Amino acid sequence: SKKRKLVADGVFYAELNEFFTRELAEEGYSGVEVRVTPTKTEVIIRATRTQDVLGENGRRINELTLLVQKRFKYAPGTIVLYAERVQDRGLSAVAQAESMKFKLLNGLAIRRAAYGVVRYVMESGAKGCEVVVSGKLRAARAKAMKFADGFLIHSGQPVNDFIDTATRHVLMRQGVLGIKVKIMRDPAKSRTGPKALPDAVTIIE
C-alpha cells in the first residue's frame, strides 16, 4: 500500500539515523538523507569529518554500505552511501552535542566545555545558543546547569522553523548526564523558508 509504504520509509529513515548515530559518533555524524531513486537508493550521510567515514580509501564506506545492505535485504548494487561534509558547521545542534559528549568523556570541566561550545556556536554565525547539563556533575542532588547566550525563542512555529535541538546521554562513572543543545540560527541568512520573524515588521522611507 501507500499508507504503509511511507510509514515504513519513515521507520527506515529513523533506523538509519540511529544506526549512523551509534556507528559514526567519532566521525562527527550529523544527519542522514535517503534519496530513493527508481534505479538505486542514494543514502547520503552528512558528517563533519568525512575522512574517518572513508577510512582506508573507502573501506569504511564500503563496509557501511554492505551493513545497511545486509540488514535491509537489498540486491547488491541497488543501494549506495555518500559521505558529505556539512556546510552547516557547529551551527548544528547534534554536532555540538556530540562534541560536548566527547569532551566530557575524554575529560573536561562541564562549565568550561559548555562555555566553549556556546562560544563556538555563537562565533559560527548563530543567533543565540543554549546548553543545558542535567545530572550529577559532582555527586549531589543532580542540579541542572544552564548556559545561554544571545537571542532565543521558545514558542510557536518559529521554533520548528529556525531552531535546532539535540539531546545526548553522556555516561561517566557516576550516573548519566543529559546534554541539551539548542541553536537558534539567524532567520535573515536562512537561504530557504521564512527569512524573518512573524512579528518582525520593517518599514522603509
Binding site: 510509514v7 519513515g10 529513515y13 529513523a14 539515523n17
Partner: protein, 52 residues
C-alpha cells in the same frame, strides 16, 4: 529442542517493539510496530508531526 518453544503466533507475546523489545504499549497502526514511548521519541524522525 522439542520443549523450548510454546507457540507465539498471536497475542501480546507474538510481537515486540522493533526498537526496545517491549510487549506493552505496542503501536501496530500502519505497521509501525513501535512501543508507545519509543514512537514518541522517534516521531519526528519518521514523519509524524504535531499540528493540532
Amino acid at each position: 529442542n522439542v520443549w523450548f518453544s510454546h507457540p507465539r503466533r498471536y497475542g501480546k507475546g507474538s510481537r515486540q517493539c522493533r526498537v526496545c523489545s517491549s510487549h506493552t504499549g505496542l503501536i501496530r497502526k500502519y505497521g509501525l510496530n513501535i512501543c508507545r514511548q519509543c514512537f514518541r521519541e522517534k516521531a519526528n524522525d519518521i514523519g509524524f508531526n504535531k499540528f493540532r
